[PDB]
Design a protein around this ligand. Structure first.
Ligand code: MN
Ligand code: MN
Ligand code: MN
Ligand code: MN
Ligand code: MN
Lengths: 238, 236
DNA sequence: AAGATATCTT
DNA sequence: CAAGATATCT
């Protein structure tokens, strides 16, 4: 499928190529930094050509937000099925030591999930799937000078791993951020995201949970986690 | 000076080079995107070796944050006087052809000496802003021989180095993330320092006492004139 | 002015 | 974990 081919292409590109710098049209290269702000951007730009190639191979149109601050990073759709759009979002996180547990922030829970056209390229109800291409990397004089046309240039990361999974599948029950009201993913090992070991039973449960999750702990008398939500649901949503 | 040599070096590097992609050790090039989140990152990495070069020429050690989410991008200090550090922070904004920058939070290091800062705030004697302004303009890969044909995600870029206080405005630059907003002016005003604050003392005091929401501010002050009136009322 | 867009630190 | 930080934009 488009999906099996997408993840295959991503997993494969990550194996065969290592980003190591920014290059100008004149051939001068500037090294990269080791913080997530830099790597998330690098990993996303590294993903863009692959995502588009595969989509074109499957007859899908690819569209990126025309305006900034609009989810998702990529919208894939066939003209023939305008209401079956697929949102693909690239997310990145780090770890100081490989194999440790990781967590991702999975977008806000007060924008498009609560409002059909809020901060999304197309209305939420036109997408039938929301995929997450998650990247994980172990943080790592040389990075201070410029280089000319590779191999010597030090790479600010170690053991980059990539996965593709449904957002609802890896969604957790605890916020991924406070003042920016983000859904938090499960806090588990990379293998757990690949195998889809989340906490919701269905996409509808994930949606209902985040659509009724309160903004601050002061959730006290509603629900703060999946167990409480199920009890809340059992009682009649009150 | 270090400042004049840095400003010059910045201008020259900007005139001489156009970043056009990310390159792998294998020679394959991925193009750049056209949003601030991407450009801010590129403009900053572009700034690093030059800031480091001039610092070396002047005998300053350069330190970047070891920890994420800590101001500033670059901490410079001479090995003899460690208590007189210079903070250099890169900021970026776009133009579809008057501009404004967010200038960092007003509830972190300026209210607490050790909050979100690499070194105590009181060890810094200067806070410089290297501002990049770009006019907003592929999904294919390229090789070295195709450098000149890689589409740039910007039509033109202008860079400036000014003191933070000098370009600071009086309205926030963000709400839930409580950032100071710069003045809303033309690129030339940032270069020439046509601010609103009478002094860095006034800038600091204004942002250290700016309330987070309009409700709170409406009892104190929402702009420069009101803060001045608040001062006269005895800071009450 | 308030709150979105992406992640991380305390 | 929560809350609030990191950078910008809508
Ligand atoms: Mn994007
Ligand atoms: Mn993304
Ligand atoms: Mn962890
Ligand atoms: Mn919109
Ligand atoms: Mn700290």
């Amino acid at each position: 499928s488009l999906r099996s081919d997408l993840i295959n292409a991503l997993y494969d590109e990550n194996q065969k190529y290592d980003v190591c710098g920014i290059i100008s049209a004149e051939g001068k290269i500037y090294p990269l930094g080791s913080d997530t702000k830099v790597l998330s951007t690098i990993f996303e730009l590294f993903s863009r050509p692959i995502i588009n190639k595969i989509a074109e191979k499957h007859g899908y149109i690819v569209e990126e937000p025309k305006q900034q601050n609009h989810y998702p990073d990529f919208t894939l759709y066939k003209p023939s099925e305008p209401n079956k759009k697929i949102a693909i979002d690239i997310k990145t996180t780090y770890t100081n030591k490989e194999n440790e547990k990781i967590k991702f922030t999975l977008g806000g829970y007060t924008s498009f999930i609560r409002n059909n056209t809020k901060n999304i390229v197309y209305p939420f109800d036109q997408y039938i799937a929301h995929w997450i291409i998650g990247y994980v990397y172990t943080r790592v004089k040389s990075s201070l000078k410029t280089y000319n046309i590779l191999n010597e240039i030090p790479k600010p990361y170690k053991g980059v791993k990539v996965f593709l999974q449904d957002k609802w599948v890896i969604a957790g029950d605890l916020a991924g951020s406070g003042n920016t009201t983000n859904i938090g993913s499960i806090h588990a090992h990379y293998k757990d995201f690949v195998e889809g070991k989340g906490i919701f039973d269905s996409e509808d449960e994930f949606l209902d949970y985040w659509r009724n999750y309160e903004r601050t702990s002061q959730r006290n008398d509603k629900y703060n986690n999946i167990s409480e939500y199920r009890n809340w649901i059992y009682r009649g949503r009150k």
